[PDB]
Symmetry: D2
Subunit: 372 residues, 4 copies
C-alpha cells in the first residue's frame, strides 16, 4: 500500500517530515504502508521546486489548494507556520484526506475547535506532531507507569528550556508574532511538555500560571513588539489527583532543547532529559536497601519501538527517529483503518489548556480546564 | 579567648554541631575564637551523660535552664525540636547569651516574631542554621551573581526533594506532628531553599502555593499525620524576577536533592547538593563554538577556600558546612559584629511559610508580610 | 549530479545516508541513486531492495561491477569478502566505500590499498564515528592550538551485547571470517580516532583476551573478546586503548580523554551530542570541563539540525560520511579515512596481535 | 580507654582523632591528641594549638622515647618515612604511615620486618579504600553480586602541578619523594585494585615527565605521569593510570570493574555515589544504578542519618581511625597493614623496572 503525501511547508520540519517519509520503511519492515513524496508545496514556485529537489518529491506547487483538490493525494502533512494549520486542515478534511498537522494545532482553542469539528465525524486518520512522546525513552516511561512499576503518580515536573533567542538582537520572526504563532514559549515548546503530562499522568483539571516577556521588542530583520510570552510557568492539578508544574522559556543560557520531566510515584520515580534522549532514569522503591537509586536505561531492541530502530542501545537516537516512529504509527493507523494518538482531539485539548494558562495569568487565579 | 558553648539537644543534629565546635579552628587558622564544649542538655540525666561522653563536652545536664543561668556560658546552641526553640532563645536572650538556633526558627511566624523581638535590640550575635547556604558552590554562586557575571536574574527554580519517609511504615516521629513540628516539608526542608532564594535572588514579594499530604497516617513509635509532606509554590520576587520552589518527602531516589537553576540575562547557574562539590555556570560571553555549562569544582580559588582542602574535589561533606558556619558565627562574636542569616532572616522565612500556607488555603496569590 | 550506487549487503544505515544525504547538505555535492543491491540469494536481495528502496536486485555481486552505468560501490559484507569485492571494483574504475575493518589482516588489506592507490577513484573505509560532530569539534579545538600540544590519550569502546555466554556464535566470533574479534570489530574505530586527533602510532604493547570460549549455533570462539594496547605516537604523545564485548552496563561506549598542555577533551558517544572541553586559560575561580552541545556553530553544523541537542543519532554520522565521500567524487579530491588508513589500522591490528604474542612492544609499519 | 597519639595533610588526621568517637559510638577507644611534632619548636607549638594537642616537640625521637603515649602516626615526606617507622616499631609503638611506605621497596622491607613478629596493630594510610562507596563495591563483589571479576581500569588524574610555573616542592625531588605520581597518587589505585580484586602477578608500564624544570628554577627529576597494564593472580586483566598534567581533573580517583554478571564504576570527584549495573536486571530496565551511601551501606552505622547528606575527605579518615582504634582495643590486625604497604612498594618497583627496559615484570609476591 503506497500512499502519496502532499507536504505543505519545506522549512525546518519540511526536512524532518521528508526524512521520515524516506526512511520509515527501512526502519519498520515490513512497513504497514509505503510513503510517497508525491508533491511538496511552498510560498513560491522556485522554493517549491528547490524543496522538491532537496527532499525528493516528484512534483512541486506554489498553491497548496492544488494538493487538496488533487484526488490522488491520500495524506496532507501541514508543516506551515501556525496561521495556516486550520484553513488547510479543514479543506483537507472536507476533501476526505488523512491529515498530520504540526503543533500547536492552531493559534487559539476556538480555531483548534473548528479543525477538530471538521475531522471528528469523517472516516480519516488525523494526527498532531507531538513527536517527543515517541522518543523511545518516553514510551519506556509510559510502559513502566502503565504496568504499575512506580505505583500511583503523585507529582509531575516538566520543562522545555531553550536559549536560541536569549540575545535581544535576535529578530522578530513569526514565532514572536502573536497573530501568526498565537503564543510564544507556551504554544511553540510548552505544548510538547503538556502533551507528555497528558500521556504520562492524565488529564488536566486546572492551571495556575505566570507568563513573562523578557525581550519586549526585537529588530524587524527582513524594532517590532514581541506580543507573546518568552517564558511560562504553571502549576497543574490532574483529574486523577496528581499535582504538577510546567516551565518553558526561550531565555535560559546553557539550555538548548532541554525537554525534561520528573515523575514521583508511590513506588518509584522517573526522570527524562531529551538533550540525552537515549537515556531514561528510573528508581524502584522495591530495590534492596543497599542497592536503591536511579538506574540509567539506554534504549534499544528491548524497549518500546526497539524492533524498528537500531540493533544496540546507544547507537544513537536523534530528532529524526522521533519523526520516523511518528510516521510509522500514523501510516499503520491508516493501513489498518484505525485511529492514532495524539489526534486533533489531543491537539484541541492542548489548545484549551494553553488558553486556560493565558486566562489564569491575566486573572492571576486558578482556572479550570474545559475537557472537550 | 575561649568561648564556652551550651548545647541544648544531642540528636541527629547532635554530632553535626559538636563536630563544628571540635574542628572549626583546625580549618580556619588563626581562629577568631576557640569553641569549648562546656555543657550539653538532653531530656534525662543518663541520656545527657551518654551524649556528653560521645560529643566530648566537659559537663552535662538534664535541665536546659541550668545552662542559661550559668554566667560562664558565652554561646547557646539550640538543636531541639521546633516546639522549644522560642522559649529557650527568649530566655537565653534575657541572659545576654549569643544564640545559634536550628531551623525552622519556630513553629509559626507568630512564635518566630517573639524570638526576633527578644534579640532585636539586645547586643548579641543571633544566627539561624541555614548552613547549606555556606556550601562553597553556593557562596561561589553568590560570587558570580553579585559580580554581575550572569546579568540581571530572570528566573529561579529551587528544589529540596527527599524520600526517607516515602515508606508509609516509617514511624510517626515529631517531624510529622503539627503541634510540635509546626509544619512538615515546608518547615523542615523548604526553609533551606527559601533562604537560598533570599540569599541569591532577593526578597519575596508574593507566593501562590499548594501543600500536599500523601501518607496521612503512620505507625506510632497508628496515628494521624496533620502536616505537609510536599510543597509547591510559585514566587514573585521584589526585584521583578519570577520563580518556584518545590520540596517533598515522597520522591523515591531523591535523598538530599537540594538544587537550584538560576537564569540571568548574561548567564545561568545550576547547583546540586547531592554533588555539593560542583557548581554549573554557563556564560553568554563564551565563544559561540565553545559555549555551555562549565562544571566548577570548589577549593582554594573559591569562597571559604583558604580554610578548607588544598585541592578542589578532595571533597566537601555535611560537616564542612557546619565548620564554615561556626567560623562565621564566632568571627562575628569575636568582632562584636553580626552574621547572616540571623533571626531577622529566620523570622522572614517563617513569614514566607505562613504566607505559603495561607496561599495554599486560599488558592490565591498572597503578599509576603515583608 | 546523479551518481548511481550499488550497495552489497546494518545495510539500513548505509541506505538511510543515500536517501537522506541531500536533505541535510544542500546544495548536494551529487544526488545518490539506490540503483542495485546484492545479498546471498535473489529473494532476500529482492526483500532488501523493497525495504531499502533500490531500483534493482541480484544475488550475484559480480553483476554490479560488471555494470558500467554504476558509479559507486558500497561494501557492507562481512569481513571475509571486502578485498575480493574491493580489488574487483577497483579494476573497473569504481568509486568505493568499504566497511571496517578493511579486511581480516594487514596483508589482505595491502591488496586493496595497491588495487586503488594507482587508480583515478575516490576510496574510503567506513570510520563514521569520527564524523560525529562532537569529534569533529574536538579537532577544530586541537588544530587551532586551543588545548596546546597533546600529551596523553585514553580511547575505549565497551560493549555488552554478547556478555551472555548463550548469545549465539555469529560470524563476528570466527577468525575464519571476522579476522579478529573486538580488535577488528570495534577497537578499529578508536584507533582511527587516535590517528585523526593525536596522530600516527609508533609502537604498541597489548593483552588480548577471550572470556567466552564456546557459544551456541555449541562451537568454539577463536578470537579476542577484549583488547588493551599501550601506545607511543609519532608526535611523541602517549596513550592506551581498551575495547571489549564483556562490560555489562556498557552498550556503545566509545570514550576518549585527551590531555594537552593548555586543556583537555572528553567524549562519550552514548551522549554523542556533548563534548566536554576544559581550558587552562579560564579564570581560576570558574575553570573546568565545559559541556558543549553540538549545533549550527560547530563543524558539519550548517547541514544538520537548526539548534543544538535537537539530537544527533547513528544515522547523521553515516549521512556526513556519504556527504564527504560524494564531495570527494563530485570535486575529484579525496576522502580521508581511505584504504591507506584502513591498511595502516589493519597493521596496527597486526602489531597488536604480535604484541600480545611476543609480550612486548612492536613498532608499526608507518606507510 | 584513652589511646594517646603522637602526630609526627596534618589537619586531616587531627580531625579524625577529634571527631571519630562522636561518629562511631559506643566508641571503641577515645583517642588523645597528646603530642605533635614538626620541623621546629615554633611550628610545633603553633600546630599544637591549631590541632588541639596537649603537647608539641621539634624532635620526633621524643615521642618514641615517651612511654606514656600509645600510638605513633607518621605524616612527613617520604625521606623521613623509614627511620621513624623502625624506631617506633623497636619502641613497640602502634603505627599509621602516609603513603607511599617509602621512596623504594628496598627501604619498605625493613619497616615490615621491624613490625610483624611483635603483634603491633600497624597500618598504612590508604584512606580512599574506606570511602563508603568503595566499601560497598567490596561488599557487592564479596557477595558474588557481579560474579567473577574479568577486567579493571583505575585512575588518579590531577592538575595542581599542571602550570610549569608551579613551584619545585618535595614531590618533584627524587631523593626526598622516591616516586612522583606513581608513589604520590597511583599508589592509592594499586591499593584499591589489591582490595577489590587481588594480587598483582606481572606489570608493564610507561613513566612520563612533561615539565623537567620548575621554579623553587631547579630541575624536576621524577615521574609526572605513569601508565601501567596488569595481570592479576586470579586471571583478571587491568590498567592503572595517574597524572599531574590533566587539566580539568582535580582529585579524579576512579575505577571501572567488569564482572561476570555486572559492572561497578567509581568517581571520587563524586564520592557519595557508587554506580553498579547488575546483569540480572530485567532486559527492559537494565543498567547502571547510582547508589548514594548512607545507613543501609557499610560504615553507615556511624555517619550521617540520610544518604547524600554528604561525605568529605574527613569522613574517609574518621573511618580509617575507627578501624585502627577498633584494631587496638580488640587486638587483631588491620588492612591495609605494613604487609599491604610493602607489597605496594614492591609493585611500585616492578613498575619502575617495567618501564626501565620496556617489557613485562613479575611482582615479587612477598
Ligand atoms: C513547528 O512546526 C511547524 C513548522 O515550523 P518550522 O518549519 O519550524 O517553521 P519555518 O518558518 O522553518 O517553516 C515555515 C515554512 O512554511 C512555508 N510557508 C508559509 N506559508 C506557506 C504557504 N502558503 N504555502 C506553502 N508553504 C508556506 C514557508 O515558506 C516556510 O518555508 C510550526 O507550526 C511549529 O509549530
Ligand atoms: O517543535 C519545535 C522544537 O522541536 C524546537 O523548539 C523550537 C522549535 O524547534 C519548535 O517549533
Ligand atoms: O595522598 C594525597 C592525595 O590524597 C592528594 O593528591 C595530592 C596529595 O593530595 C597526595 O599526597
Amino acid at each position: 500500500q503506497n500512499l502519496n503525501v502532499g507536504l505543505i511547508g519545506g522549512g525546518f520540519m519540511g526536512k524532518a517530515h521528508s526524512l521520515a517519509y524516506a526512511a520509515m520503511p527501512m526502519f519498520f519492515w515490513p512497513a504497514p504502508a509505503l510513503p510517497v513524496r508525491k508533491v511538496i508545496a511552498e510560498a513560491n514556485p522556485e522554493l517549491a521546486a528547490e524543496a522538491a529537489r532537496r527532499f525528493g518529491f516528484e512534483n512541486s506547487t506554489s498553491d497548496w489548494r492544488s494538493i487538496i483538490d488533487d484526488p490522488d493525494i491520500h495524506v496532507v502533512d501541514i508543516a506551515t507556520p501556525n496561521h495556516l494549520h486550520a484553513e488547510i486542515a479543514i479543506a483537507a478534511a472536507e476533501a476526505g484526506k488523512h491529515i498530520i498537522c504540526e503543533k500547536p494545532l492552531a493559534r487559539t482553542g476556538e480555531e483548534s475547535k473548528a479543525m477538530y469539528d471538521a475531522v471528528k465525524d469523517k472516516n480519516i486518520v488525523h494526527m498532531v506532531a507531538f513527536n517527543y512522546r515517541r522518543t523511545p525513552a518516553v514510551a519506556l516511561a509510559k510502559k513502566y507507569i502503565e504496568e504499575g512499576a512506580i505505583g500511583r503518580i503523585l507529582s509531575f515536573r516538566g520543562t522545555y528550556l531553550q536559549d536560541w533567542s536569549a540575545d535581544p538582537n535576535s529578530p522578530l520572526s513569526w514565532r514572536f508574532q502573536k497573530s501568526i504563532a498565537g503564543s510564544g514559549a507556551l504554544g511553540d515548546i510548552a505544548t510538547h511538555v503538556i502533551d507528555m503530562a497528558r500521556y504520562l499522568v492524565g488529564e488536566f483539571s486546572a492551571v495556575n500560571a505566570v507568563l513573562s516577556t523578557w525581550i519586549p521588542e526585537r529588530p524587524l530583520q527582513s524594532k517590532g513588539p514581541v506580543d507573546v510570552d518568552d517564558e511560562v510557568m504553571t502549576m497543574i492539578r490532574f483529574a486523577n489527583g496528581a499535582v504538577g508544574s510546567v516551565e518553558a522559556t526561550r531565555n535560559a543560557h546553557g539550555r538548548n532543547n532541554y525537554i525534561t520531566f520528573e515523575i514521583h510515584g508511590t513506588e518509584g520515580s522517573i526522570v527524562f532529559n531529551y538533550e540525552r534522549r537515549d537515556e531514561l532514569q528510573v528508581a524502584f522503591a522495591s530495590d534492596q536497601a543497599d542497592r536503591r537509586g536511579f538506574r540509567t536505561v539506554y534504549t534499544g531492541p528491548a524497549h518500546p519501538y526497539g524492533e524498528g530502530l537500531w540493533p544496540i542501545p546507544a547507537l544513537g537516537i536523534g530528532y529524526g527517529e522521533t519523526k520516523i516512529i511518528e510516521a510509522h504509527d500514523f501510516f499503520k493507523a491508516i493501513a489498518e483503518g484505525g485511529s492514532v494518538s495524539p489526534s486533533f482531539a489531543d491537539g484541541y485539548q492542548v489548545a484549551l489548556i494553553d488558553d486556560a494558562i493565558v486566562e489564569s495569568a491575566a486573572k492571576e487565579s486558578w482556572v479550570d480546564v474545559p475537557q472537550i
